[PDB]
Amino acid sequence: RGVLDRGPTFKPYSGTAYNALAPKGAPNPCEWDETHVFGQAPYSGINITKEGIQIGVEGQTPKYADKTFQPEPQIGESQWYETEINHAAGRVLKKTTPMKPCYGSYAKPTNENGGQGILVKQQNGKLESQVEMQFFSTTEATAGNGDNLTPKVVLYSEDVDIETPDTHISYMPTIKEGNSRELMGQQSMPNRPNYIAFRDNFIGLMYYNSTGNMGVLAGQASQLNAVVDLQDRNTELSYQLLLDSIGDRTRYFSMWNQAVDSYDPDVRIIENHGTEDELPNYCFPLGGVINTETLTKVKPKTGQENGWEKDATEFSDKNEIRVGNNFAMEINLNANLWRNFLYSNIALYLPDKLKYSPSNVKISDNPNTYDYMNKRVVAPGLVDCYINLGARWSLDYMDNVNPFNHHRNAGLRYRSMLLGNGRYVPFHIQVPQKFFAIKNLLLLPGSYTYEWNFRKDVNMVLQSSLGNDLRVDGASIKFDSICLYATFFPMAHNTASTLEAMLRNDTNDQSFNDYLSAANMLYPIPANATNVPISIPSRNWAAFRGWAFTRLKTKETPSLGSGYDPYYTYSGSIPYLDGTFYLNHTFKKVAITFDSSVSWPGNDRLLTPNEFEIKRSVDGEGYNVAQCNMTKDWFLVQMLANYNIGYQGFYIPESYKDRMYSFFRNFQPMSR
Amino acid sequence: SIPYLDGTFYLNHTFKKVAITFDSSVSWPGNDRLLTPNEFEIKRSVDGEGYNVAQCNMTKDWFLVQMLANYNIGYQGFYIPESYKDRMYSFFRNFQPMSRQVVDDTKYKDYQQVGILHQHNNSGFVGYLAPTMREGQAYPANFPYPLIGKTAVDSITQKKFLCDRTLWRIPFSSNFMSMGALTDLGQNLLYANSAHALDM
Amino acid sequence: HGTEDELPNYCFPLGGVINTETLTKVKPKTGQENGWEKDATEFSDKNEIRVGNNFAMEINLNANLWRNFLYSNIALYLPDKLKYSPSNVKISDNPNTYDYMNKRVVAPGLVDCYINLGARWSLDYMDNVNPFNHHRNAGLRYRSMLLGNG
Amino acid sequence: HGTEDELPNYCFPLGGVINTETLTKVKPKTGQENGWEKDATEFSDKNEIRVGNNFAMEINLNANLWRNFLYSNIALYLPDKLKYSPSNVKISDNPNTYDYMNKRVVAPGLVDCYINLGARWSLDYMDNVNPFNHHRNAGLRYRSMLLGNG
Amino acid sequence: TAVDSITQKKFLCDRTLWRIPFSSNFMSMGALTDLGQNLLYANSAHALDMTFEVDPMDEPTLLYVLFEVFDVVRVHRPHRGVIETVYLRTPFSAGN
Amino acid sequence: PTIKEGNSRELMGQQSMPNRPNYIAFRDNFIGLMYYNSTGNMGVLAGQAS
Amino acid sequence: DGASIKFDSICLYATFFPMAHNTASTLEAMLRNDTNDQSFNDYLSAANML
């Protein structure tokens, strides 16, 4: 219960809602000083003399329109073609407003009308918008006392308090910030899309494997606990791995983010097979032809041969007709959008070091800050169409990066879009409790105690779709009164007092465990040290199910066991939480060994006797099986665990054996 | 467009409360059964979003009625339905919750009114009233007040839900279980009783 | 099901402001009513102000794209009867091979968004030829891209 | 969510450039420094070269198509009294009849890619009217064109 | 345009754990596999060493390795209201 | 813009716009023919004697 | 026209079982009968004539 604040850290949309159909590099009508260049005219008139426009003769009195609303961009003229207007009117923003591209321009309608005006005026009742009624004459009239210097355009200057939200410019010509002519090459680069809400199926909301303050369940008589966690234990990874069996974790539900963080198979693995552009498409000029030529009609009467005088009844001399073909400006549509999406989705979520540094614009301090990663734009060349066309192959270039922070996830996208698009929110939900001991328990009557805590840091509790911090940037969450919604069955009161007999005795006790009942261990591997093993002294371990290892980053998570940690400066996808074990292929060879003796597979069963080669590239075409880089030592191994394949031959699994977090779903072999 | 004959319903979402009353005496429960002792709310009122689950105003006194008819989710645990249990016209598949946030009317300074055609966002390229070609020029937009990216405009979230094709399911039981023809409270101690007046 | 593009799309010019028209400024006090000379603090006539309707160079995007879909997706595996090899260019002679039918030019002036429009019907000559032998498949897609590009 | 058009889409004018200036050749031999005469093999008196920048035509492609996606199949299925129609052209009577409810078109800006942008939201605008009058049904899609198309 | 090349083939494989069973067969049949509680690995003490090798490292990363341990509870109730608690992680020197 | 017959100056600025679609089709089972439930035009459907 | 094929080497591989002697010594003889003989058939046992 309470309120959430996202901050200036998020953008659920990738595009623009503010003049996003006008040209990218074209500035708004405004003036500069050293002489002016720009000015536009949409509105119509009859005859202007001492006032701004005369827009009508209404009845018996002429009317000139107010400064509040005057040239609405909506209204133009009934005709499409090149037609001439005697009296026109348009807005030309005042000299407090610099040259700024239309693509991404927000304005504040201060008055009753949507036509945005001034805020400050004189002392009595500051209301009237300082919109200039200064008309513009033509070169036709300059001299003569009494001669009409009648305006063709009347330009309307506005002093409006404005800010730019949806765009931040990539390339600017000169330093000048007040007024300058040299902001002509100034264009519009939209901000990087990223959305912030609950991590998939309420994960990371409460503490799991953190016993500074534990999830203790006691009793009004009972002194004991229900939480006994350690750093060498998993509870965050449980509620996804065991829940893989009970339906595919993709189905649409709003409470828990039941659709889980999942990359597009079209985006991560590139489907580069060119473009369908085999036909040219055309952007014909206004309606066909733009030319004015005198064309006078002709017909034979006296001149019998080739030479004739003129026509009988002559058509009017103004004939805007082409002698040849009507024009068409050629476009290849298929290739245009292909650059837009493929250059974007690869370069957007790439680590920023080769990316660009300050050029005539303001920039933030830290590399991991939202605004620092925002204004950076690498060249559309390597991330373009033509890297390796004709191969369903994600290159060595892309595969190292955080492949879950994307444009469309089943998880990431679903939460923020149903949370409340914006910072300040009054919203409530029933929130999780996921321990194995607590789950499917039917409590006996009596007197009990139930004690908990929360991880308060904004950074860890909520995800980011680009990989930008909340606590370090600007975000805070406040909590009100927390509740519990306990639901049980309305049992028959004769039975509710007698069915207890099973749990009334210490003979049969509701026993629970994780499917991954495992205990781990953390150890760091830095740069220029590719060979790191594990050494543990003599230990009395009895049972064992097997082994499962993958990779975690120190950059995107620290050695956690509390809320308050200054180490956590990221907010991206974590392998420990969302099942984001993306760097699984990063294993060359694995050799297991026991207590002071020779390494594990000594019972000689495979081509390589001791070391399990996970990856061997172009070493020998007979070690890496079925055109996949994996060696036979590990290729058979994956379908040998839960699957019963590798003795009866080779089987292709049914539509339920591949429970989403398993092998073929995730991984697909590739070649270039 | 027809809701009833086609099977593709739509109107299931907009209902405040269904106050079931057997002859003006203690209501359909009569055992303090749920959160409400007299009423059966569907679309919760603005009063108490804390009780509502699933990131909407969906009340929990009834999120244990349609969630317990076709498939029992609300005793043994808040579990996940199968692709077979969740049918093409059942409670879960077609129903998908929704939420919004844009602008608040009572918190901001200059937000007096933004009109229908008074706006100035993508005009010029877009028509004045008809689908006509380039009529006008380009001028800065003013309609969608953002609280997104690099801006601060105070806003409050509305939480309406959407129910499509789903059939308003409810078991006729004190135990709230739809099992067998002879239902738990349908044919009990004094429920196969003679004709009594009904006013709901 | 036709071409759903009820709203026009325009290939808009550079900035929308392109016409060489010199313009000055005006203001009445030397002539109080209907007679003017010059404006106060007026700046030079380097004006390029567009006076009226801005250019809109038209295109139907959903119809032009539908063209591609339908000309690339079927016409080169369309029956060879209306297909004729163009003059002034010489082609290696073998029907099926990457030269003959591959470069034999055919019209999208039939395989377009106007053949049995509205009607769901696979054309009886698409049915005569193999739909499995076309430029985009699923069987060849997961192997030719899995072997190595070239 | 809004659009994806980070790279501007251009409707390239015909063959590149047309506004070209005549150019004539000059030789370094006759005048050694700052003096130039008639060259040996002249560049012709019709050298069609526009020097500097290519003329561009911006069509922000993603917006106006998505505008139509919310227009032809969303904006045309709303409450039918605030929905607008032009003043002049001849029309029939009933709102249920073809002639009155095909000419009827609400503002193209009103239902575009900016209404409550960011959240996956459906307003009380087309949810209290059945999505069966929609252009989106798969059941009606089948039989409408399977039996006939006339 | 005939050019010469030698290909590079590589597998992608994310979001699943590298799972290997603990039996002489090396196939997980049930929960406790053959070698899990056999003749050699039952009550005696032994200490697992390693020889890991990964593809070239660039960023400081923790190689997250799970040993398949076994932690179970049992919810006792001798009196109504009073709970008796006992936990057990066995392949990690924990239990009772 | 103009009431005039056929063509006049301002009808060069006139524009065309597609009609609204209406799919004349049948229901999810096309039921609407037989009187299954209707109390009037119902079927007896009995024997040759009884 | 274009393509030429040349494979270099052929190599045998098969997936055996690390067979438990306790049962396999009986199971080898179990298959070694006139009685225990396992027959295979297709889903479509169709005879082709061109």
From Swiss-Prot, chain B:
<comment type="function">
    <text>Major capsid protein that self-associates to form 240 hexon trimers, each in the shape of a hexagon, building most of the pseudo T=25 capsid. Assembled into trimeric units with the help of the chaperone shutoff protein. Transported by pre-protein VI to the nucleus where it associates with other structural proteins to form an empty capsid. Might be involved, through its interaction with host dyneins, in the intracellular microtubule-dependent transport of incoming viral capsid to the nucleus.</text>
</comment>
<comment type="similarity">
    <text>Belongs to the adenoviridae hexon protein family.</text>
</comment>
<comment type="subunit">
    <text>Homotrimer. Interacts with the capsid vertex protein; this interaction binds the peripentonal hexons to the neighboring penton base. Interacts with the hexon-linking protein; this interaction tethers the hexons surrounding the penton to those situated in the central plate of the facet. Interacts with the hexon-interlacing protein; this interaction lashes the hexons together. Interacts with host dyneins DYNC1LI1 and DYNC1I2; this interaction might be involved in intracellular microtubule-dependent transport of incoming viral capsid.</text>
</comment>
<protein>
    <recommendedName>
        <fullName>Hexon protein</fullName>
    </recommendedName>
</protein>
<feature type="site" description="Involved in interaction with pre-protein VI">
    <location>
        <position position="74"/>
    </location>
</feature>
Swiss-Prot record, chains C, D:
<comment type="subunit">
    <text>Homotrimer. Interacts with the capsid vertex protein; this interaction binds the peripentonal hexons to the neighboring penton base. Interacts with the hexon-linking protein; this interaction tethers the hexons surrounding the penton to those situated in the central plate of the facet. Interacts with the hexon-interlacing protein; this interaction lashes the hexons together. Interacts with host dyneins DYNC1LI1 and DYNC1I2; this interaction might be involved in intracellular microtubule-dependent transport of incoming viral capsid.</text>
</comment>
<comment type="similarity">
    <text>Belongs to the adenoviridae hexon protein family.</text>
</comment>
<protein>
    <recommendedName>
        <fullName>Hexon protein</fullName>
    </recommendedName>
</protein>
<comment type="function">
    <text>Major capsid protein that self-associates to form 240 hexon trimers, each in the shape of a hexagon, building most of the pseudo T=25 capsid. Assembled into trimeric units with the help of the chaperone shutoff protein. Transported by pre-protein VI to the nucleus where it associates with other structural proteins to form an empty capsid. Might be involved, through its interaction with host dyneins, in the intracellular microtubule-dependent transport of incoming viral capsid to the nucleus.</text>
</comment>
Curated annotation (Swiss-Prot), chain G:
<protein>
    <recommendedName>
        <fullName>Hexon protein</fullName>
    </recommendedName>
</protein>
<comment type="function">
    <text>Major capsid protein that self-associates to form 240 hexon trimers, each in the shape of a hexagon, building most of the pseudo T=25 capsid. Assembled into trimeric units with the help of the chaperone shutoff protein. Transported by pre-protein VI to the nucleus where it associates with other structural proteins to form an empty capsid. Might be involved, through its interaction with host dyneins, in the intracellular microtubule-dependent transport of incoming viral capsid to the nucleus.</text>
</comment>
<comment type="similarity">
    <text>Belongs to the adenoviridae hexon protein family.</text>
</comment>
<comment type="subunit">
    <text>Homotrimer. Interacts with the capsid vertex protein; this interaction binds the peripentonal hexons to the neighboring penton base. Interacts with the hexon-linking protein; this interaction tethers the hexons surrounding the penton to those situated in the central plate of the facet. Interacts with the hexon-interlacing protein; this interaction lashes the hexons together. Interacts with host dyneins DYNC1LI1 and DYNC1I2; this interaction might be involved in intracellular microtubule-dependent transport of incoming viral capsid.</text>
</comment>
